[PDB]
Amino acid sequence: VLLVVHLVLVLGGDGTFLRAAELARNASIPVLGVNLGRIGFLAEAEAEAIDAVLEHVVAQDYRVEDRLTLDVVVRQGGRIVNRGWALNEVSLEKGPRLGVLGVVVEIDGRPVSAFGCDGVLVSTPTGSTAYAFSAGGPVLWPDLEAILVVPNNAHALFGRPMVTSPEATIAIEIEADGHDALVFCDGRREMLIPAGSRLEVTRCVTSVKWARLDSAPFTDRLVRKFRLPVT
Amino acid sequence: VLLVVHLVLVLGGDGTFLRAAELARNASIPVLGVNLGRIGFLAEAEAEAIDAVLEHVVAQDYRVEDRLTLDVVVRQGGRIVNRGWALNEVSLEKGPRLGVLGVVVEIDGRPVSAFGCDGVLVSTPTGSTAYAFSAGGPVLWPDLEAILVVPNNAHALFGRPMVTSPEATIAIEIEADGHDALVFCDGRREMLIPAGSRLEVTRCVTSVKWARLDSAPFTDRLVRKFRLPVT
Amino acid sequence: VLLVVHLVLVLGGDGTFLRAAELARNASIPVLGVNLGRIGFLAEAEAEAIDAVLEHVVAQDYRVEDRLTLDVVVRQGGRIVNRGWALNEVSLEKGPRLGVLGVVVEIDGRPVSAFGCDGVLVSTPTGSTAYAFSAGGPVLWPDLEAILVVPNNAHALFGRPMVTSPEATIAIEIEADGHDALVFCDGRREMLIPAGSRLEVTRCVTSVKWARLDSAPFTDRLVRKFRLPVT
Amino acid sequence: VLLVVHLVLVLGGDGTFLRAAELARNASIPVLGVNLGRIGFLAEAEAEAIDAVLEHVVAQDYRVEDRLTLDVVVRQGGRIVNRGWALNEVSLEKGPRLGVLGVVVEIDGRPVSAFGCDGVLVSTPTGSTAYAFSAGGPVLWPDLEAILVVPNNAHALFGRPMVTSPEATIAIEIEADGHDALVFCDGRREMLIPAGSRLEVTRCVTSVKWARLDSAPFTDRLVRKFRLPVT
Numbered sequence: 007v008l009l010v011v012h013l014v015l016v017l018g019g020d021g022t023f024l025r026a027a028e029l030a031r032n033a034s035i036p037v038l039g040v041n042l043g044r045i046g047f048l049a050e051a052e053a054e055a056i057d058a059v060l061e062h063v064v065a066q067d068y069r070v071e072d073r074l075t076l077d078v079v080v081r082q083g084g085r086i087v088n089r090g091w092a093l094n095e096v097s098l099e100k101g102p103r104l105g106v107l108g109v110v111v112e113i114d115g116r117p118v119s120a121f122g123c124d125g126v127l128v129s130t131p132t133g134s135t136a137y138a139f140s141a142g143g144p145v146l147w148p149d150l151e152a153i154l155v156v157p158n159n160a161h162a163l164f165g166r167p168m169v170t171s172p173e174a175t176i177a178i179e180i181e182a183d184g185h186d187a188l189v190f191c192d193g194r195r196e197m198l199i200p201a202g203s204r205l206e207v208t209r210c211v212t213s214v215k216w217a218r219l220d221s222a223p224f225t226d227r228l229v230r231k232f233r234l235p236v237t
Numbered sequence: 238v239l240l241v242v243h244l245v246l247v248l249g250g251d252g253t254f255l256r257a258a259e260l261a262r263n264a265s266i267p268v269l270g271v272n273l274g275r276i277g278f279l280a281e282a283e284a285e286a287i288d289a290v291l292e293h294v295v296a297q298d299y300r301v302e303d304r305l306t307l308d309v310v311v312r313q314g315g316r317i318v319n320r321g322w323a324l325n326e327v328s329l330e331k332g333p334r335l336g337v338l339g340v341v342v343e344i345d346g347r348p349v350s351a352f353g354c355d356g357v358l359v360s361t362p363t364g365s366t367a368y369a370f371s372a373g374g375p376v377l378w379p380d381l382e383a384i385l386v387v388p389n390n391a392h393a394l395f396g397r398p399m400v401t402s403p404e405a406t407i408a409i410e411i412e413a414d415g416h417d418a419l420v421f422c423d424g425r426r427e428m429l430i431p432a433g434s435r436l437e438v439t440r441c442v443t444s445v446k447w448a449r450l451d452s453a454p455f456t457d458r459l460v461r462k463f464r465l466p467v468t
Numbered sequence: 469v470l471l472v473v474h475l476v477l478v479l480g481g482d483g484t485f486l487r488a489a490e491l492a493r494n495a496s497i498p499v500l501g502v503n504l505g506r507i508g509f510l511a512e513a514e515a516e517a518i519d520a521v522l523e524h525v526v527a528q529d530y531r532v533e534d535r536l537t538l539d540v541v542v543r544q545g546g547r548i549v550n551r552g553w554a555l556n557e558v559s560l561e562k563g564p565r566l567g568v569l570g571v572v573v574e575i576d577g578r579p580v581s582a583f584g585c586d587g588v589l590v591s592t593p594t595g596s597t598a599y600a601f602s603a604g605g606p607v608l609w610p611d612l613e614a615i616l617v618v619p620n621n622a623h624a625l626f627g628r629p630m631v632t633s634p635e636a637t638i639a640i641e642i643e644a645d646g647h648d649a650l651v652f653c654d655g656r657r658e659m660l661i662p663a664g665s666r667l668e669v670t671r672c673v674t675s676v677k678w679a680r681l682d683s684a685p686f687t688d689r690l691v692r693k694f695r696l697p698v699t
Numbered sequence: 700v701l702l703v704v705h706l707v708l709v710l711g712g713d714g715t716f717l718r719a720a721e722l723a724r725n726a727s728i729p730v731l732g733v734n735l736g737r738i739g740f741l742a743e744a745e746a747e748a749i750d751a752v753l754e755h756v757v758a759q760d761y762r763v764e765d766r767l768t769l770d771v772v773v774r775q776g777g778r779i780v781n782r783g784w785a786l787n788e789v790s791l792e793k794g795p796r797l798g799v800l801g802v803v804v805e806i807d808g809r810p811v812s813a814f815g816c817d818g819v820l821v822s823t824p825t826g827s828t829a830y831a832f833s834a835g836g837p838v839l840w841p842d843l844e845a846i847l848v849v850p851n852n853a854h855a856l857f858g859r860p861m862v863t864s865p866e867a868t869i870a871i872e873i874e875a876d877g878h879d880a881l882v883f884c885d886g887r888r889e890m891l892i893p894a895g896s897r898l899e900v901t902r903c904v905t906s907v908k909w910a911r912l913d914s915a916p917f918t919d920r921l922v923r924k925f926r927l928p929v930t
């Protein structure tokens with residue numbers, strides 16, 4: 007049992023959760039998280055109804071559901087040249103003081119889209135209401151089994167989000183003649199994506215573990231924290 | 238093994254499968270079909286290499302996935318007054334020479350959003366590439382197990398497509414105080430919705446049955462039928 | 469100075485202005501109105517501080533901008549068979565118990581896109597916050613001089629809203645080979661469109677006349693009527 | 700008369716054009732540009748029908764139309780702390796190895812939207828078919844008079860593009876507690892946007908000059924170069 011702060015417990019926020027989640031996954035030990043004042047999505051609770059929280063983790067009140075989390079590898083011609091993971095997503099991204107980045111999205115070996123773009127977001131349903139949400143994404147209910155593909159500012163006619171089945175092979179091909187790209191996962195863990203390389207995102211063998219205290223619907227979080235006028 | 242035209246076999250189009258597959262639906266027997274010149278999505282075989290198909294119908298060579306399908310009934314407080322099912326999706330539609338239709342959208346029995354609109358769409362993943370796509374909805378992998386909610390011309394701040402978990406219950410309550418609506422199922426099977434009714438879609442217990450001949454990736458159908466510019 | 473209810477004065481709603489403003493339209497005399505409790509966009513005055521308004525109607529204190537309005541006629545090869553005008557917009561709409569409507573979209577007499585759909589919308593900038601908004605269209609500043617094209621539930625790769633120059637001619641040719649459609653004007657004034665017709669909208673020579681009482685910024689209307697979350 | 704390369708003439712592409720355009724504006728001298736093989740939007744011609752090009756610039760075949768171009772100022776409390784311009788746009792942007800950037804969009808002194816975001820794109824109609832296009836933007840016909848406001852990946856419920864009248868005051872307020880932001884214009888001319896600062900985009904007194912050789916419709920460029928299936 008462990009704590010990361012301002013079974014796994016975390017007392018802070020979404021930023022700290024995906025920080026939490028990293029090891030909690032790593033150690034196949036269910037993560038648990040509670041808000042510390044600052045409003046954030048992923049946190050099952052606020053820092054106000056506390057005692058019950060801790061108590062329930064001692065009284066053993068929660069569950070662990072297989073949240074899709076993704077494994078990312080960059081490989082240089084046959085040759086895996088880098089590996090990663092993320093609870094939220096794998097953000098393919100261009101440098102900042104740079105221009106449009108050339109990229110090919112292939113799913114299950116068919117290239118579904120090519121374009122110039124800020125980058126590509128392949129996100130879990132678990133993180134469907136983040137950046138991918140930012141990029142026009144649909145909301146995915148955390149318990150789905152699927153992969154979310156949402157391009158980042160694509161100079162293209164077609165960039166409609168695609169949601170494929172949990173078992174497919176998403177590939178971003180980085181143009182040779184172009185620039186080194188970037189990958190960040192859940193906000194951290196940058197890696198370099200050399201031009202000519204090729205991203206490849208897939209489901210990771212070990213999903214992370216999500217400790218539900220209130221076994222209530224996503225619909226209850228989603229409206230309250232986003233402030234949906236359900237009028 | 239029956240034949241239908243514009244084991245189940247059909248020589249027509251999308252509405253011929255929905256017609257064909259309609260009857261087979263009750264007769265538990267997997268649907269299979271050939272597109273008829275003019276672009277048709279769900280046809281595993283086309284109006285060009287039709288003959289060759291036959292073999293799979295004679296040797297009975299293909300496989301069947303239980304595609305998520307949806308069950309719908311309109312109810313006025315505890316009184317289920319009608320039910321429908323769908324291959325593509327279930328569109329609630331306002332009267333035809335009418336105006337915006339009054340609405341509150343509930344998911345998980347939780348109200349997510351209220352508004353006037355053309356209406357709201359509830360789709361099977363396979364229907365995400367039909368009406369829902371046109372109406373602003375994302376692409377879902379056909380083999381998915383999940384439900385898609387797309388509001389139809391919603392005079393709203395937010396009408397983002399929602400991809401729900403198959404273990405859900407989507408319900409739209411129709412304004413009593415206003416006009417009676419319409420509901421369609423696979424675009425066919427229209428039904429009349431009393432003002433004040435409550436729409437309610439859920440994962441259908443009896444999937445449709447699919448005759449897959451050539452086990453290629455969905456990205457190959459999606460590309461040609463949609464003619465995706467990987468330009 | 470005439471009064472209409474759910475100088476031109478009205479005590480109703482958006483469709484009461486469109487009704488009121490309708491007749492005044494021929495009578496060249498600026499429209500002015502008060503919203504009636506339930507949210508109404510175009511009302512420069514509301515159902516709360518109504519009385520105070522009056523002054524501007526008695527002292528005749530306000531000003532008039534010539535809001536771009538549009539002229540529409542349906543023609544079958546050189547034969548203009550009907551015409552309409554609009555405050556908000558001009559929606560081509562498919563038959564009501566029908567299916568997708570066949571279409572080629574031409575702007576500047578150049579074909580930009582073809583498809584089936586619910587239909588296509590042509591709007592005055594003031595109509596961009598009405599149907600066109602709901603149908604996927606952007607917000608245009610009301611005082612604009614420009615025309616907005618928004619396709620309505622278009623089974624297409626690309627149906628991006630188009631904001632054209634007022635010095636243009638937008639034309640949608642309706643499939644002959646298929647079904648007859650419908651066209652509306654301010655949602656009212658429906659017209660029947662023969663299959664094969666050719667829709668043609670252009671900058672209307674005779675703008676509507678606007679009675680602006682309180683010279684505030686449009687962002688103040690837009691915020692309250694829309695209730696924009698600057699949260 | 701002057702040339703920038705691989706009255707103003709330019710022989711290269713869109714990248715070089717907005718490079719061209721900078722001074723050509725600066726020296727109130729109409730810009731003119733011709734493709735040099737590499738496909739790009741803004742260039743009136745290709746490097747294949749050349750002689751006529753040059754010739755027409757000597758025979759004086761073209762025109763100069765007042766393309767909206769924008770003036771940008773960043774000011775530190777009353778105090779203008781930096782000024783800019785751009786033919787395309789003013790891109791408000793967060794650092795790259797950073798997180799969501801806090802920002803308030805006010806038009807004509809009413810704050811229309813606040814959110815966390817990659818940044819804000821305020822673009823001319825002249826550049827409507829670029830990044831703003833990337834960010835979900837509508838296409839604006841170059842000759843319009845308007846300002847385009849398109850947020851860059853906003854963690855917000857509402858980020859609908861807004862098109863206001865040419866004479867309004869767009870303001871992005873950079874949160875104090877946040878991070879220094881960035882501005883790039885047409886790809887160049889970076890400037891630093893300190894937290895607590897406040898962006899302010901407006902029409903620049905001197906529009907740039909666009910030299911039309913073929914006085915044809917935008918619709919002709921737009922379909923050909925984008926490859927619109929107008930089928």
Ligand SMILES: NC(=O)c1ccc[n+]([C@@H]2O[C@H](COP(=O)([O-])OP(=O)(O)OC[C@H]3O[C@@H](n4cnc5c(N)ncnc54)[C@H](O)[C@@H]3O)[C@@H](O)[C@H]2O)c1
Pocket residue numbers: 020021022024045046047048094095132133134135136137138140191192193797798799800815816817851852853854
């Ligand atoms: N929308 C954008 O422009 C943007 C900026 C970069 C990062 N992000 C997301 O933020 C996450 C990291 O956050 P940060 O601490 O680095 O701060 P940040 O400045 O990058 O902003 C992140 C915001 O998104 C929220 N968030 C994080 N993960 C989420 C999720 N899965 N679902 C819903 N909301 C979530 C956080 O609470 C915070 O409000 C990344 O995993 C990425 O998904 C999106």
Ligand SMILES: NC(=O)c1ccc[n+]([C@@H]2O[C@H](COP(=O)([O-])OP(=O)(O)OC[C@H]3O[C@@H](n4cnc5c(N)ncnc54)[C@H](O)[C@@H]3O)[C@@H](O)[C@H]2O)c1
Pocket residue numbers: 250251252253255276277278279325326363364365366367368369371372423424566567568584585586620621622623
């Ligand atoms: N686009 C719209 O706004 C709209 C309006 C009416 C109904 N529909 C759709 O019509 C479908 C039934 O089609 P129909 O054969 O009766 O003809 P139709 O005249 O209603 O037009 C259907 C169009 O959608 C295509 N289509 C049908 N199912 C599809 C699928 N699952 N994936 C991709 N494309 C598909 C057909 O090829 C055809 O081009 C319904 O499932 C509904 O989704 C769409």
Ligand SMILES: NC(=O)c1ccc[n+]([C@@H]2O[C@H](COP(=O)([O-])OP(=O)(O)OC[C@H]3O[C@@H](n4cnc5c(N)ncnc54)[C@H](O)[C@@H]3O)[C@@H](O)[C@H]2O)c1
Pocket residue numbers: 335336337353354355389390391392481482483484486507508509510556557594595596597598599600602603654655
């Ligand atoms: N949302 C849709 O899919 C849809 C379908 C039918 C027609 N319409 C719109 O209906 C409008 C006429 O409205 P109605 O009074 O006859 O009632 P209605 O029953 O057709 O609903 C109109 C709704 O749009 C609002 N509205 C009307 N004009 C507006 C404007 N210019 N800006 C912002 N909001 C506006 C009204 O307040 C009302 O909420 C037409 O101009 C058309 O744009 C929209």
Ligand SMILES: NC(=O)c1ccc[n+]([C@@H]2O[C@H](COP(=O)([O-])OP(=O)(O)OC[C@H]3O[C@@H](n4cnc5c(N)ncnc54)[C@H](O)[C@@H]3O)[C@@H](O)[C@H]2O)c1
Pocket residue numbers: 104105106107122123124158159160161713714715717738739740741787788825826827828829830831833884885886
């Ligand atoms: N879509 C994106 O993700 C993205 C990336 C950054 C820059 N841009 C745009 O590109 C421009 C600068 O181009 P760059 O040479 O630095 O290369 P770049 O790598 O930034 O890509 C720019 C692309 O946009 C095209 N372009 C530039 N201005 C345009 C316009 N006004 N309308 C239509 N297309 C245009 C260029 O031809 C090129 O294909 C900037 O002004 C900005 O508008 C957009």
